[PDB]
Symmetry: C3
Amino acid sequence: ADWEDNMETLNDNLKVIEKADNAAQVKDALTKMRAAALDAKKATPPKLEDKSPASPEMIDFRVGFDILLWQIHDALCLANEGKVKEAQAAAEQLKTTVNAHWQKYR
Amino acid sequence: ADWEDNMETLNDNLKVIEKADNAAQVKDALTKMRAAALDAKKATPPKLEDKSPASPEMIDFRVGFDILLWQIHDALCLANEGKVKEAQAAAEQLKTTVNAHWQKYR
Amino acid sequence: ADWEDNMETLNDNLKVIEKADNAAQVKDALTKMRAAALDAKKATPPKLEDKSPASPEMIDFRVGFDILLWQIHDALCLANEGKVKEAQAAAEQLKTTVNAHWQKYR
Ligand SMILES: [Ca+2]
Ligand SMILES: [Ca+2]
Ligand SMILES: [Ca+2]
Ligand SMILES: [Cl-]
Ligand SMILES: [Cl-]
Ligand SMILES: [Cl-]
Ligand SMILES: [Cl-]
Ligand SMILES: [Cl-]
Ligand SMILES: [Cl-]
Ligand SMILES: [Co+2]
Ligand SMILES: [Co+2]
Ligand code: NA
């Protein structure tokens, strides 16, 4: 998928997590976010379409999605332990990272 | 160890998992798989030897190994929770991903 | 931060972990290590300033931080489960890897 569509997926699953009722729902949403973030790693965002795929700017873009993947895992590890409210709180940090990525690269 | 030797290591530990009984065996084979996948991520596979190191194809190859690493992680998580049968089923699907990447880039 | 400052951050937190009393301290130090490893993926060791950003040597450099990040993941999952002595044992393995990567690229 396109970068913008992956970003839509990330925001939508953040909403799902915010209203989630159990650990399975959180796990499922975070899995979909992980797939969207790994897919966005292969994309080029609008701001960087005038940069080469291995420019320092594009390497930093990909590393920013690595950062997001490890934050997704923090929430996911909490959810795997059945600690649903803790995982939702952790998803708050994901909102910050996603919004900052949106604003930096759109 | 080059890329093809790492793919062989991955397949060997997949067999080890499929015949394992206790969770420490599965976990040990999965940890060896993680190391092999990380070593393969920094290789150039035979199909892409004529491509620029800065090519989109090489970036896609490396992100594909990140995808494999998170699938390995999911299996490893199931094995850490003592869910031997579930981890072995997860590794059965890993056979597909690993051998798909193998045939794709050999 | 540049590469050597990030490696210093890794080493500082490995010492904090060695001399830690509870799991919260281990978790805090490990989260800092993760942030430094990720940030170092965007850095360039002085002796590689001339190579391409996607040169095989720079790929090697970045994937070496992925290797560290998965070791940190193991230690941090152990610390989140209260397995403090086990987390510290894993961090002692981390020390070896950090020093090897330092020797490789400095
Ligand atoms: Ca759209
Ligand atoms: Ca372009
Ligand atoms: Ca290295
Ligand atoms: Cl939409
Ligand atoms: Cl990268
Ligand atoms: Cl990459
Ligand atoms: Cl140089
Ligand atoms: Cl790259
Ligand atoms: Cl890379
Ligand atoms: Co890269
Ligand atoms: Co995990
Ligand atoms: Na030089």
